[PDB]
């Protein structure tokens, strides 16, 4: 609930780098098109223009005094791995050895290419090693996909139709457990240790499952949401065992309503105690209503804060936890020290399609704009 002026945190901007030509039209679908290997020091960015793999070094350039901060660096050396269809989702395994690319294709449907990251290490084929075909409809659109934080071979995939599958990849893709579209899953997140899986549902609950998909716990749809105004879970981040960031948005799927970011703290001795739900409302100010709602959440443990970014907003805001470690504040930063996405040549807002944090160089936040520009920032706490 509470804002507080932080004069001790800067997002210090680095040179923007163009990675793709500007689209003819604003992308509207839920996407996650940016990935970082902090192990091998790589950035992976995808789109309709194929898949690009950069050495993270090449993308992190600081502007010197005299440098027009608004200048966009022309292009940077990387590998181009041509893709038949537009990628909407990229994600790594936890051991950084497997990259998954979700493509949507009018003839085949939606399908996941799995790559052995080590292949990108060679000169001139660079084929994936498995393909998985999720769907033949716009229903097969992948809305959420995360790999297990402690189990390299395992990943949860979440479709537009509201169905989920847990997969194991080794020599091939093995489908371990699915749940049908009637379940209406809208989002997924692994527990910190990867022992359970959290799924956000169309009915605004979050259900904790074991990877086998045996139901362990249900997190109620907060009591302050009137039936009159139903919410679905949009995005969820399982931060600590009993601590969640659950984003809620209009159930009907309306875009006009801006979704709320909520820190949920769960009881241990449940019967009887209630859960604390602390609303942040819109921490990333919504300026667009064209794009599908999506909140990119990231937890920084070291600083005990979340970085939030919204599909509908040009700003990255911070939700930090107070020293009591029960409450959170939003921070307000000096105008010269914010991470906000640039305005396009056409005078338009550019919005995020991917967010990631590199440690291999300060930590660095990186955003990929709807304009195909990459915006990196040092973080100084």
């Amino acid at each position: 609930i509470p804002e507080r002026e932080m004069k001790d945190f800067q997002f210090r901007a680095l040179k923007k780098v163009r990675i793709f030509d500007s689209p003819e039209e604003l992308p509207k679908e839920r996407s996650s098109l940016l990935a970082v290997s902090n192990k091998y020091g790589l950035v992976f960015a995808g789109g309709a223009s194929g898949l690009q793999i950069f050495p993270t070094k090449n993308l992190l350039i600081q502007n010197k005094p005299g440098d027009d901060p608004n200048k966009i660096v022309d292009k940077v050396q990387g590998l181009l791995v041509p893709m038949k269809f537009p990628i909407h989702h990229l994600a790594l395994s936890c051991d950084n050895l497997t990259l998954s690319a979700c493509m949507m294709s009018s003839e085949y449907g939606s399908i996941i290419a799995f790559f052995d990251v080590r292949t990108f290490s060679n000169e001139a084929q660079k084929r994936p090693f498995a393909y998985h075909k999720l769907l033949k409809d716009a229903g097969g659109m992948v809305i959420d996909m995360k790999w297990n934080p402690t189990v390299p071979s395992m990943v949860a995939v979440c479709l537009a139709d509201g169905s989920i599958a847990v997969l194991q990849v080794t020599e091939t893709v093995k489908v371990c457990a699915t749940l049908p579209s009637t379940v209406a899953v809208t989002s997924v997140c692994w527990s910190p240790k990867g022992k359970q899986l959290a799924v956000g549902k169309q009915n605004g609950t979050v259900v904790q499952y074991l990877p086998t998909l045996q139901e362990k716990k249900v997190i109620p749809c907060p009591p302050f949401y009137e039936s009159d105004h139903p919410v679905r879970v949009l995005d969820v981040l399982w931060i600590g065992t009993y601590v969640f960031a659950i984003v809620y948005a209009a159930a009907d799927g309306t875009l006009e309503t801006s979704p709320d970011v909520v820190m949920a703290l769960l009881p241990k001795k449940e019967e009887k105690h209630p859960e604390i739900f602390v609303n942040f409302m819109e921490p990333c100010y919504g300026s667009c209503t064209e794009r599908q709602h999506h909140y990119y959440l990231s937890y920084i443990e070291e600083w005990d804060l979340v970085l939030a970014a919204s599909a509908a907003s040009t700003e990255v805001s911070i939700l930090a936890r107070q020293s009591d470690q029960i409450n959170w504040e939003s921070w307000l930063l000096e105008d010269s020290s914010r991470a906000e996405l640039p305005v396009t040549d056409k005078s338009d807002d550019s919005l995020p399609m991917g967010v990631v944090v590199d440690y291999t160089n300060a930590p660095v936040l990186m955003l990929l704009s709807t304009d195909g520009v990459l915006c990196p920032f040092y973080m100084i706490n």
Binding site: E5, K7, R12, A13, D68, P69, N70, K71, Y285, S287, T314, L332, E334, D335, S336, S337, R338, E340, P342, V343, S347, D349
Partner: protein
Amino acid sequence: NQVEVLQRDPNSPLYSVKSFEELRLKPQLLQGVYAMGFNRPSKIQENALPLMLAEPPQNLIAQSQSGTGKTAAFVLAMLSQVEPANKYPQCLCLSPTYELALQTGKVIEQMGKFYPELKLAYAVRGNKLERGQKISEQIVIGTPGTVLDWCSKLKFIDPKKIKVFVLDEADVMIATQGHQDQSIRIQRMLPRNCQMLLFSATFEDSVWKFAQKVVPDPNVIKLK
């Protein structure tokens, strides 16, 4: 040397001014100018003032080294259009720094002293409020991030009610992080007939390209 008129649109008055009296200001306002020790207009003010006070109003891009001259010029423009009767921002001024903002603020306060009901808000780092409350002040000054915040994130300011918009030291402005895009996003918010006024000591390609995005149909003037 004189001012250089580099682009002058029609319906924009063609006369230089040699006295603040021939500007036909309100008495309260003229006394204000006089009280600061401005007994006659400066070189820049000779042309900038007629352009800015013309009816109906005209947007201006103005090259001049910053100084009391140019500032008082745009401060007067702002005060001219204010209606202390209506208790809400009507004039918005963007400074590149907190320090410049306070400094220009003084100038407003000084020049508006004989305005009894007129009050000035600072959209800067430090000043806080709750989200419920619209502010009462009729002129607002600050740095673009916080001004942007105010206008659209915190609902402090209804941008659709601002009739004069100053963008000061635009060179210094877009040299600092995020300010360029903040300014653009604020101006976007303002109504069609709001008066756009930009000032910069220097005009390099970037700055000039910027200025044109921000200020439609401008008068362009440069001193010396």
